[PDB]
Design a protein around this ligand. Structure first.
Ligand SMILES: [Mg+2]
Ligand SMILES: [Mg+2]
Lengths: 276, 275, 276, 275
């Protein structure tokens, strides 16, 4: 009695919750100064571009790696932008490794304000009907779904401990559409799972954090023939693949105070690919 | 050169593919006379409803169980409707088991025309943050996603061998929305996966089969009072559904009533996903 | 006090509402015997196929026409299936004509149980940037949106008077995706509007009726070159255009007691076109 | 022959098209320094928030009004941020008016780089079945859909002439879900139309412009208590949003921060569309 109780999440407490106090200047909303970001898969590709953009925005950055040493990448951020950066080696497929890596990052930086769950794996084996060995399926799920959940489960405890945070899960247009002509049902499945995990966690963590996805389309960064890429261009309204530098604005948007009412959303950056 | 080649799947051959001959009368399109259906999770709940309606439509039905013997339920189908029916035990979380089960089923009935992948593992443990056993996460992913993929992977080979088939994956409104107030992110995740797996397989199997999902809302089958009251308040029709309100959609997707329907998600939820 | 009040629609009364009593036989759920259906745009194409399938299911059928006489079509249903059928001439763009036509149909058949709002118009003028005359835009909206709303607004009063009904709005994949290579923004806009009108009405009419859409893909029934259709086939997972006879099962599904828990839904029949 | 021709729009020319040069520093991508923005419905509410944030980002801003004089609001922008600004009166429901307004605006500022189509007609009359005046329906469709199309139709010619542009259409969560308990089917219909119009124009304008939507949830701008309480109960964040929580997205879509973003729908709703 005497309380408007949420239908979504009672841990919100009596409603309405209070809006944050923000700068009246839109440009200040995007600064990450005074914040710690942890960006997985940041030894290259999208994760590196996001890690570097967050440093530009003023954030201390924990980069992750596994196959290739990124200590000099983390050192490069320190030297270039005057920000604390350290690199961490971890197999995202191993939940104990994730727990220890996250626990260690909390010690070195003090806290974590922004987390980017950036799971990189692809399915290149064609139609699944001819892949009788479930090791390919199971490897996609372990890295691209379980590995994303391990990171989320651990970072949510830190967000709740601190009463604040912003989790970004890197999904894909493959979470919304079925890629053609390269058939990759297992990858599309894990990415769709990622997208709806982010929305589910958005409800569960709303008293202490925001959760959103970025869904990139075809970004210029393997076994893609010229005639395959040609078909991608033909079906993309802008007519080309994107650049990693065209993703960083969306990742900064979701990481910062520019999006404090944005949760459970999927920011699609795909040159229009999902529209036809 | 000279052919129109699909951008979706070159196994379609030169385009356009050709349409089937269909009955002149709309009611005959829904008949399963002459067909074999295999319905997982069929010892009760939604699965049993579907298996019985398929026999009413005239189908031989393989029912599945895991908990209690369903042989008598299969005998009821055989007795009441005059069709072939048998019960099979399998842990769909184990691929050898489902492979051997589906292999045995096509031996026993000759073929499989209609398959319903129905997973039944639920998440009852509240917000995931306080559940430090990935055992519950792993259990949901293993049965509700991996298990559905094992059935799919195996039934596709049969459909491709025969050049025909209809796969229905039972998903949930949880594949589209986030249930409240009972928080169940792992369940929602697996059901969204199933929904997009179906769409992906629809492209891959298009030369020989259709793949669609049914997404039920809140169905009163075989939850606190205040919880259910909130579900009712948020449901446009104002109530939970009955299993008899699902079988029409399952028969639609199973039969020649839907021969141009593939990769679709048939939502049966009293409007729940609309507000 | 003493009442669970809907958050959706208080006219539902105290919750839960009561489920209908249905046949225990699935095949009986699809019969339309004892019911009156009104199918607009039924002088040919999809509307004719639906009108004939409903007669096969046992329903009395009111067919609509405007440009071509359908009296002999309505007469053909009577002679062939032993069902009451009459044809009505009406310009769906004129709201008074719609009101009078619906009011007249209620008299002749006694009631209306099933209504199919089947608005037929297309945009063939290419990209809108070069159509400076708004008469093309306004004609699409008037027929494909306003005309659908006129029919709905009028049939809802009859459904509410009787406490029962099933409205089906014929939408299109164009309501969900952007057709290519033929550019038709005005048509896609009206069809998207239709799809979300159906969901909106589903909430508002839930005490007395169900509202759903059928969204056909490319169905073989104008100014479509061979190379245009070729591109449609290439992007369609089944690899072909559909037949009108592949739509009637979905229209029967939504019209009958097979779908009494189905409301606010969009049944897509498109050979998979919206999946890539 | 020899070229790769788009399946979306042959006006793209031989594929692939080419990417723009962009600033090395992510913060510079958000600058509107050197650009002209035109924001409809800009005498207050969301529109004014957007117009002021664009000037903060360094943009010349044309503001629109229809009710009260906004010339002073435009003078405030000119005074506080050191940019060009002017207020224009127009009934966006009348195409001659918006055509003449937009023509006058490109004359006064030289060009238009960013356009925000923001319609503000709301439906407050409850369930449509008791509203026998299509005057309210026609009013919503005329302003919230036709009016948005008139602005779009006219600004596209400018973008195409200049080979550059970003159009943001303000839609609503009402374009995706059905608001409860206040029933407003005509508003929901027009907003869904706007959302798909934006996607359609994104394909058509791709050789020279980007088109995206912002879909705000419940924003407390300038409704009974029990009504708002239910909105809060159904919002995952547990509150209404502030206009200052929208301007980040509007600046993202307006600027070179989003040069690969087109046909997208940026939802800012506290999670409302998730359950
Ligand atoms: Mg598509
Ligand atoms: Mg909802």
């Amino acid at each position: 009695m005497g309380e408007i109780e949420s239908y979504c999440n009672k841990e919100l407490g009596p409603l309405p919750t209070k809006a944050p106090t923000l700068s009246k200047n839109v440009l200040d909303l995007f600064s990450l100064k005074g914040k710690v970001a942890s960006v997985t898969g940041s030894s290259g590709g999208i994760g590196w571009a996001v890690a570097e953009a967050y440093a530009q925005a003023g954030a201390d950055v924990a980069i992750w790696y596994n196959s290739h040493p990124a200590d000099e990448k983390a050192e490069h951020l320190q030297k270039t932008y005057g920000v604390h950066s350290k690199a961490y080696k971890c197999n995202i497929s191993d939940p104990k490794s994730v727990e220890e890596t996250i626990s260690q990052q909390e010690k070195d930086f003090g806290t974590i304000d922004v987390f980017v769950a950036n799971a990189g794996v692809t399915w290149t084996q064609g139609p699944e009907i001819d892949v009788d060995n479930y090791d390919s399926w199971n490897k996609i799920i372990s890295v691209d779904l379980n590995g994303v959940y391990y990171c989320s489960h651990n970072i949510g405890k830190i967000f709740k401990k601190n009463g604040k945070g912003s989790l970004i899960i890197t999904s894909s247009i493959s979470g919304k559409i079925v890629n053609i002509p390269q058939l990759q049902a297992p990858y599309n499945t894990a990415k769709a799972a990622c997208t709806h995990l982010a929305k589910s966690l958005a409800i569960e963590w709303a008293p202490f954090a925001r959760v959103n996805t970025i869904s990139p389309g075809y970004i210029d960064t393997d076994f893609a023939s010229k005639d395959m890429k040609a078909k991608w261009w033909q079906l993309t309204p802008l007519g080309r693949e994107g650049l990693t530098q065209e993703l960083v604005g969306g990742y900064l948007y979701l990481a910062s105070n520019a999006s404090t009412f944005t949760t459970g959303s999927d920011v699609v950056i795909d040159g229009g690919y999902t529209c036809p």
